[PDB]
Amino acid sequence: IQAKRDAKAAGSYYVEAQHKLVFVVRIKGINKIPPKPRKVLQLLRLTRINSGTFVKVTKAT
Amino acid sequence: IHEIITVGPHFKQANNFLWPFKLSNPSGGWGVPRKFKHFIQGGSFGNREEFINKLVKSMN
Amino acid sequence: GIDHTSKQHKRSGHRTAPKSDNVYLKLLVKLYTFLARRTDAPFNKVVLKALFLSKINRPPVSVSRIARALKQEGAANKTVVVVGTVTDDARIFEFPKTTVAALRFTAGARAKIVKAGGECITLDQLAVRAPKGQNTLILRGPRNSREAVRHFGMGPHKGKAPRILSTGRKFERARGRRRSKGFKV
Amino acid sequence: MAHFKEYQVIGRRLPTESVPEPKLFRMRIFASNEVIAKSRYWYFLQKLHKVKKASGEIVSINQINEAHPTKVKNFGVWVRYDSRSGTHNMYKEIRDVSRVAAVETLYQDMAARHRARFRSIHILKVAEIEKTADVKRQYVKQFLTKDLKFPLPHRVQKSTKTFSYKRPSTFY
Amino acid sequence: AKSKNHTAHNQTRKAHRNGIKKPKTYKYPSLKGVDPKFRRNHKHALHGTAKALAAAKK
Amino acid sequence: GKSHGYRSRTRYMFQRDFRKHGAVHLSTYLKVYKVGDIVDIKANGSIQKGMPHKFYQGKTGVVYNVTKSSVGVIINKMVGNRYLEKRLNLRVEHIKHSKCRQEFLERVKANAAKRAEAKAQGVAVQLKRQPAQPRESRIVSTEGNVPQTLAPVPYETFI
RNA sequence: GGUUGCGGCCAUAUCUACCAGAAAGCACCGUUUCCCGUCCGAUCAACUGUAGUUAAGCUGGUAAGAGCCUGACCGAGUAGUGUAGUGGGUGACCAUACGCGAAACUCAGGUGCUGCAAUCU
RNA sequence: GCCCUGAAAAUGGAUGGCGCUCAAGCGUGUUACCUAUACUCUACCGUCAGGGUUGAUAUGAUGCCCUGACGAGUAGGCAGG
RNA sequence: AAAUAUGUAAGAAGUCCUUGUUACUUAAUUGAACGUGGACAUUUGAAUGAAGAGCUUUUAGUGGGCCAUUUUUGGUAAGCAGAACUGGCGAUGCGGGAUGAACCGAACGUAGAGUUAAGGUGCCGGAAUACACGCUCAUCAGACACCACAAAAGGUGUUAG
RNA sequence: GGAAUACUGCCAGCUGGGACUGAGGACUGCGACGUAAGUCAAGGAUGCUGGCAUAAUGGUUAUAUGCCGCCCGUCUUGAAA
Ligand SMILES: [Mg+2]
Ligand SMILES: [Mg+2]
Ligand SMILES: [Mg+2]
Ligand SMILES: [Mg+2]
Ligand SMILES: [Mg+2]
Ligand SMILES: [Mg+2]
Ligand SMILES: [Mg+2]
Ligand SMILES: [Mg+2]
Ligand SMILES: [Mg+2]
Ligand SMILES: [Mg+2]
Ligand SMILES: [Mg+2]
Ligand SMILES: [Mg+2]
Ligand SMILES: [Mg+2]
Ligand SMILES: [Mg+2]
Ligand SMILES: [Mg+2]
Ligand SMILES: [Mg+2]
Ligand SMILES: [Mg+2]
Ligand SMILES: [Mg+2]
Ligand SMILES: [Mg+2]
Ligand SMILES: [Mg+2]
Ligand SMILES: [Mg+2]
Ligand SMILES: [Mg+2]
Ligand SMILES: [Mg+2]
Ligand SMILES: [Mg+2]
Ligand SMILES: [Mg+2]
Ligand SMILES: [Mg+2]
Ligand SMILES: [Mg+2]
Ligand SMILES: [Mg+2]
Ligand SMILES: [Mg+2]
Ligand SMILES: [Mg+2]
Ligand SMILES: [Mg+2]
Ligand SMILES: [Mg+2]
Ligand SMILES: [Mg+2]
Ligand SMILES: [Mg+2]
Ligand SMILES: [Mg+2]
Ligand SMILES: [Mg+2]
Ligand SMILES: [Mg+2]
Ligand SMILES: [Mg+2]
Ligand SMILES: [Mg+2]
Ligand SMILES: [Mg+2]
Ligand SMILES: [Mg+2]
Ligand SMILES: [Mg+2]
Ligand SMILES: [Mg+2]
Ligand SMILES: [Mg+2]
Ligand SMILES: [Mg+2]
Ligand SMILES: [Mg+2]
Ligand SMILES: [Mg+2]
Ligand SMILES: [Mg+2]
Ligand SMILES: [Mg+2]
Ligand SMILES: [Mg+2]
Ligand SMILES: [Mg+2]
Ligand SMILES: [Mg+2]
Ligand SMILES: [Mg+2]
DSSP: OOOHHHHTTTTTEEEOOOOEEEEEEEEEOOOOHHHHHHHHHHHHTSTTTTEEEEEEEOOOO | HHHTOOOOTTTHHHHHHHOEEEOOOTTTTTTSOOOOOOTTTTSSSSGGGGGGHHHHHHHO | OOOOOSSSSSOSSSOOOSOOHHHHHHHHHHHHHHHHHHHHOOOHHHHHTSSOOOTSSSSSHHHHHHHHTTTTTTTTTTTEEEEEEEEETTOOOOOOOOOOEEEEEOOOHHHHHTTTTOEEEEEEHHHHTTTTTTEEEOOOOOSSSGGGGTTTTTTTTTTTOOOOSSSSTSSOOOOOBBBSSBOOO | OOOOOOEEEEEEEOOSSSSOOOOOEEEEEESSSSHHHHHHHHOOOOOSSSGGGEEEEEEEEEEEESSSSTSSSEEEEEEEEEESEEEEEEEEEEEEOHHHHHHHHHHHHHHHHOOOGGGGGEEEEEEEOTTTTSOOOOHTTTSSSTOOOOOSSSSOOOOOOOOOOSOOOOOO | OOOOOOOOHHHHHHSSSBBOOOOOOOSSSSOOTTOHHHHHHHHHHHHHHHHHHHHTTO | OOOOOOOTTTTTTTTTBBTSSOOOOHHHHHHHTTTOOOEOOOOOOTTTTTTOOOTTOEEEEEEEEEESSEEEEEEEEEEEEEEEEEEEEEGGGGGOOOOOHHHHHHHHHHHHHHHHHHTTTTOOOSSSOOOOOOOOOOOOOOOOOOOOOOOOOOOOOOO
């Protein structure tokens, strides 16, 4: 917070650290899904509608 | 919890330990007519950023 | 629904008792599952399992096969377990002493062994002397020595065996079996 | 795209050792939340400078609350939009209390008349017509006369119950 | 009468039931089609390098 | 009738590079190949002999054999529902050392070196490749950089 | 740094025109008994390094030079395109969302680098 | 943009029907509300998996007991009855 | 000269040092292959997942297909013929599209309570004759993807530009 | 110049109404509050009161009422045809 108010005070802009964490909920059901995303869906354990997991953000994820 | 929110060293093994969360459907509703457009286009699907909380909390 | 990644309700493709019905074997099992459960000792877990095997996966262990496994360094005084039936082999002469725990012994096999001042225990006897299966040497027989398995793979250039009912020239030794009669195999 | 908020979006190219400290660029953006704002900032930037977001970052995002949000204003609005057969530029005026107010009727008005959904419309400039009689579009000049007063003929009180034991009057 | 002629439809579904795997892998792999003289000499470099090790046990 | 000769559909695959026809440079003949080398297969249609069948164009594999003028290469190839093992007799003119393996060896040499200079300090290493991460917080300044503010552009035909 | 022999990458090296080139080298060049090849000692072969010459080859320099190379927030985040929608539109076709992204064009810089061995004011 | 002309077929008829005109029509936006065999929690059946347990101790050891997950089906395969 | 697709690699079957074998190869104990002996295990060499991995034998049915988005060939076209990837129908009920193989939503043991999807909420019919800004008057209005069609061309109707 | 408020988010802040469920059957576990003895909302409901006798209730059946339900068998890409 204060980092933001300082930067403002010094005529600058504290641009925040990119989020390292996201939560993913799957909202589409299980029929008619294309093979590629379907695979990725399972490798994040989202294999059933409204189920959700955490994901660490890197380029690879 | 800490090991998650901070990511950090054994996040992997911490998070994997965690069985996928079984949320309900959103009590309150999805807040949009059709869900299978993007959040930017009028609702659901894609990164809705720090809006995910209001969503999850109603599915929780 | 569930995007299943795994076949649901699949059964461990593993025998779980003997299919057999020899009450004495079921008794032998009832013994070694007790041992297997109430101890560590890998040996019992292994014997337990191996009592479930079908007659094909219990090929016979020979008396020469035992003798030769006993010329192993530091093994001359171990007690050879053969969850199966030990047979006789006229082809070794000098045969050592030792005590052998098997399921069955052929006539000549408990001769040979005994005559050499050796012993022929049973696995439930063995159980007592060696609760945790100590000083034991487990020996299985040659499975692939079977005659059935000769014909497994039968294809061009696999060099396996034909299922033929009677052999000779005039029986599948011509076209396809040589360069001079079309092609070879 | 709905109840509108106005945003300042300040962004830049990602720094290179060769170009540390690249130039900063700003837009005023009307969107309902900030995600759509940020997304709009790129949409436009991509069309002006040679940049996509994978090669840039957004520095700041701040809401621009109307300065005098209870003073009635005459607005100039310039617009670029897509019809079914061409694309066009277009000036129109809107009398309202805030920019955020104005833009919303702008966005509705474009749908009503030229059937233009939000996607097909670029908001060029928006501005408070300082000196009245710089207003040109009559349908606002009409409201600028001295001692403007008018009635609302044919009142239609909505009813609470389905039967009525009297024949209604429309008299305001 | 005329009938459909060809299609690969459904064929990768079929191939991917219990399929693809990888290729099976071994140290000391097949020596099929390797230069016969070299094999011949390898034969001898092995017998020798064997020998010499049993000589180192007495 | 249909036509499925050996070099079919290879009009552009076996063409030479624009302004690179003629004699194949000597470098090609001076590279040395041992077994276990990982080679890239890319036909040269001027050297007609020892040619890879068009399948293997663009495919990498390992040398299983070395001969007077050619390497033998092992390729894994999917037919049906399974990879099969494939042995190719390719003249060297159609073959190349795979740079990606050289990235690897060089990295292995790096990682033994890093590991030393840490035991020579008894400190920790951290040797696995990490993937490209988020971004940490920054403070960009406005000194000499008051944000130029832009707006969308009018329509205008130029034709 | 020159030069030569053997090279590597094979135009930043090639093309056109004009000059310039110490020293060494290379070259042109002199000769035809001999091995040798020609319609022709021109090529090829041998001989002298002696009679000559930098004219040429070769090396560099010039040129709003042709070509070729390099760059660029030059055009263009355009064209094309993977994914999305019970999006627009009679349709032809098009806009938007998350992504990838050129060619030509324009301008700017450049015009061989280099290994081994030998040799030179 | 909407509306009008351009706009002709055979039983009597179809925005699903009624009917609707500041709509109950067209464009757009805001909320609330209705509802699948889907999602969340729980009982029960079964199937599959993991575990405990006849140690001297009445009545099933192919048993008793604890735990998790899963359940569409032609042609066809096997199993328990 | 893309995009999408596509090959390979990311280590113990590894890395390093020492020096053994041979009839191959080198001018050459030079190489080449395969070894002895010694050293190196915290992240041992990216991510994420793993409901276990590996493996054998044997046999049923089937061997007319069809549909949708996209790519695409023949044809004026076709609810026509014919290929590409994928997802479907076939084999599959359930909720929505009145209706309907194939669209949308979602796949199914027997049930209770909750919440939703796609689609709806004047009345038939469960659910605001809700809120908000415009637009439109048709003596042939119009009313929702697949979808049950409409075009060139015109209008001093009316709206905004 | 000093405030308020909106919007958004947080509280291991305090509370009212309504609905469905009550599996298990000695004890063993993790806690909570207590100075303590003890108490508890802590590994699944108990307590208090009342109703029922040719009856309260439950099963079957017939009929009516709301919604829903085409003829099976078969060959077929496709059958109520
Ligand atoms: Mg809920
Ligand atoms: Mg509420
Ligand atoms: Mg509700
Ligand atoms: Mg909204
Ligand atoms: Mg041995
Ligand atoms: Mg065998
Ligand atoms: Mg035999
Ligand atoms: Mg009155
Ligand atoms: Mg026929
Ligand atoms: Mg046909
Ligand atoms: Mg056929
Ligand atoms: Mg045919
Ligand atoms: Mg052809
Ligand atoms: Mg082609
Ligand atoms: Mg040439
Ligand atoms: Mg040839
Ligand atoms: Mg001559
Ligand atoms: Mg001459
Ligand atoms: Mg000469
Ligand atoms: Mg010359
Ligand atoms: Mg030039
Ligand atoms: Mg879809
Ligand atoms: Mg469309
Ligand atoms: Mg249409
Ligand atoms: Mg396009
Ligand atoms: Mg007619
Ligand atoms: Mg009629
Ligand atoms: Mg329409
Ligand atoms: Mg409306
Ligand atoms: Mg609307
Ligand atoms: Mg149910
Ligand atoms: Mg079933
Ligand atoms: Mg792949
Ligand atoms: Mg992993
Ligand atoms: Mg079969
Ligand atoms: Mg078959
Ligand atoms: Mg068949
Ligand atoms: Mg379906
Ligand atoms: Mg059929
Ligand atoms: Mg279905
Ligand atoms: Mg319909
Ligand atoms: Mg009706
Ligand atoms: Mg109603
Ligand atoms: Mg009304
Ligand atoms: Mg449409
Ligand atoms: Mg008009
Ligand atoms: Mg109870
Ligand atoms: Mg009674
Ligand atoms: Mg009845
Ligand atoms: Mg009915
Ligand atoms: Mg009826
Ligand atoms: Mg038919
Ligand atoms: Mg039928």
